[PDB]
């Protein structure tokens, strides 16, 4: 059925490794990484100043979408119910 | 100066777990990540999601914020340039 034991006849290795492959999914997440190898863990050193600081910007993000959204909002229902003999 | 060798009295181990550590912040980095162990990169599976979709997010974002920003910009430079005798 199988030479060797390890597993059977099957992936070989476990969930041993399985980081490391993600990992690789990961290498690419960060394109700047390549150039700042930060040890195997180098992914997740940007990974967690990524999902934090990423999502920081997010927040205040939007923040600033929300309050425009309601401006053009309000702003083109005057901008539209002036124009027409209104002064 | 030492009983066991490893290292010199400095800190044990080396860079082969220096993941686990920085994993440990990425823990937190994902909340919900404790309802969904998944495998020790489970931060990773997330990480590499966030920085990813996260980072989708914020080009679309930005990009209604830019449009928004021009509009009531626009907007209220004529809801200010009418109002005071203008029809």
Redesign the interface.
Known sequence: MADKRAHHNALERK?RD??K???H??RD??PSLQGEKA???Q??????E???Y??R??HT??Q??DD??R??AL??Q??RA??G???
């Open positions: 969930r399985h980081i492959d993600s990992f999914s990961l997440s960060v040890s195997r863990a992914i997740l050193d940007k990974a967690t990524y999902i934090q990423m999502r910007k997010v993000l939007q600033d979408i425009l959204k401006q053009n702003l083109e005057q901008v002036l124009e003999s209104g002064c």
